Subunit: 250 residues, 3 copies
Amino acid sequence: YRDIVVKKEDGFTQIVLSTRSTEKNALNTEVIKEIVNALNSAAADDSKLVLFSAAGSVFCCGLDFGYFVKHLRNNRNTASLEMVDTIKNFVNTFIQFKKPIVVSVNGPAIGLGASILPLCDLVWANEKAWFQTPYTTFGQSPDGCSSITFPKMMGKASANEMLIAGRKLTAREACAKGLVSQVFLTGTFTQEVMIQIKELASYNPIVLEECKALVRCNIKLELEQANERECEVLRKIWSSAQGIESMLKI
Amino acid sequence: TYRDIVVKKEDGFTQIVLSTRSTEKNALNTEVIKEIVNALNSAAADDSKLVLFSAAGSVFCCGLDFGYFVKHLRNNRNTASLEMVDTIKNFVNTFIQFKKPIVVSVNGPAIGLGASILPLCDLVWANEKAWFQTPYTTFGQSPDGCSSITFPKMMGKASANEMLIAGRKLTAREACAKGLVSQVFLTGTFTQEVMIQIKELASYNPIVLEECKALVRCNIKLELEQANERECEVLRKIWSSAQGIESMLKI
Amino acid sequence: YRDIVVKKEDGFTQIVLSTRSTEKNALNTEVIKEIVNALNSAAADDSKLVLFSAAGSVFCCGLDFGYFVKHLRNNRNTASLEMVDTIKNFVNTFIQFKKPIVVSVNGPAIGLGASILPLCDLVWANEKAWFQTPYTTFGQSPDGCSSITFPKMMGKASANEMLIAGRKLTAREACAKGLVSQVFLTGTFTQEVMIQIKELASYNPIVLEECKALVRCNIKLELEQANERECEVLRKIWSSAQGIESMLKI
Ligand SMILES: [Cl-]
Ligand SMILES: [Cl-]
Ligand SMILES: [Cl-]
């Protein structure tokens, strides 16, 4: 791996976002493929859970648009179709993943950076982290199943303040909305996380998987279907003159 | 031309102002419902990217005008309840089918049917002094506007029932904590803040706006139509009963 | 009876948990069979609604596992089936119940004492009450349909802070999450519940039965299947060696 660090500790595996092929941990095709491959290996591991974290001032600014736009500019529906396929499979990996994923957010989560969070099982955020899905600004419709997961958590109209209006949520605001599930003090953030993760790793593996399987059970199909619907709209938008024009805006 | 509402076709948005003259406090009667349906239908058809739905006076909407309805019900109960139920069902259905985003601006109390329609819109912008109430149990009715499912969806069932059964009032800030309101504004800058935020929304791409709304409502639109049918059948039963009329007369 | 008091007042029946057979209103087979009997009776009453309350320092500390681990020790195959069957029928009684159930929580609600709350219609809690489902310390999968009701009400990530992380919620934070529906000041708690309950019981019977029917019809089938799936998983955990090893800790 070039763009992530994977550390298999006592009963859990840390996947750390730490990109060098991109800035601010943006996701290009190759970063996404390392994540998918690291997750696939943790699934085959004897890890009980995954900690998903990031290094740097930003957690994840989401899709690297500079990278995708260059590909989209030799033409056409092709680059469009490939990029959606990549996003589709990325989101699905999270949807299908059987072990708990605890996400540690120590900086802004933006776009696909924020929209995959509700696909995880616990979301622990530094009080300094913030969250946004500036879709209307990007000129796209929702990704990461957010068209269903934001309304389920916070209700339609609060979901829309993020999906339609593009508003930033502080960590505390996102937690009252259900997007973050626990807020931590900045000074002691990383040690607070490790202590609580080692506690979680100390529990029984069968009860952790069975609890996730029972919460997973009814929601999985809905998420697969949301992802499919989201991807179909992105295919349409990203192969339109309009959609391409929008992605080109910085 | 409209008697009870004002429609403003603005820069990339349509503005529908509830401003009734034939009822008090923006109460809804048959005639006010039909104008609103009509205005929505026209906004659906023209090149507005979105609708701003608002009100004038000291209340947003006090819901159904029961003084107006109990008079017809008193004359022919079987026939008048079918009518009442048809117009409400179709009022609600108009909001369920509307494909463009509806932003509602609430600048005073929203009561009964005036609160229960809010969850069918897309953003709910409230002045800090607005409050919200569905006193169905006080009125002597069951839920309307799909609130039987939209309130449990946004709040959880028990919190839903504090509004649906217990008849409790929510300030704008506590309605915001429960998902019914989505943004709260200081009273001093309410309408100017609303107007700037609406123009920035109207600056966005129409296809992005409508696709996003379509995606969000996809797995729920059927559920809403079905709730509205269920609700209105119970309402038909209650408003055609001796107890129902009596309850309505005491409002 | 022995462990409960039934009080049939003007338009409502009150069921009071005050256990002598267990400590802190914990549930054994006998306490559970009494609650089921009271409920079935109340369903046949002319009462418009049920008030469910408790006496003592705690509301309900959940399953009495010191009682259960005992009978599981010798006959480790069929004592589990017996235990899960009692639990499944206890939960089903709430799922099926047709009149409103208001629950009054005047102290901690722990484990199955907490997870049955979402099955009732209103949950009035003293500000001093707190809520916990410490399943992963118990070493069990969720019970009471918490696998679907906690996620539905508060979002999946917030739900897992309870389901997986075993976190305690005060009455106020349980109210922000949708689990409690009204918090009361402690000095007048009792007075206020009785006043508000007689208020509710003064409403038209037809309209109370119908708001409950309109809320209930969309969700009951889901609740029944969650119960079935939760019970199956508990069959397995509680009959396994590591399960019984878990059940031993007070
Ligand atoms: Cl950096
Ligand atoms: Cl006025
Ligand atoms: Cl005691």
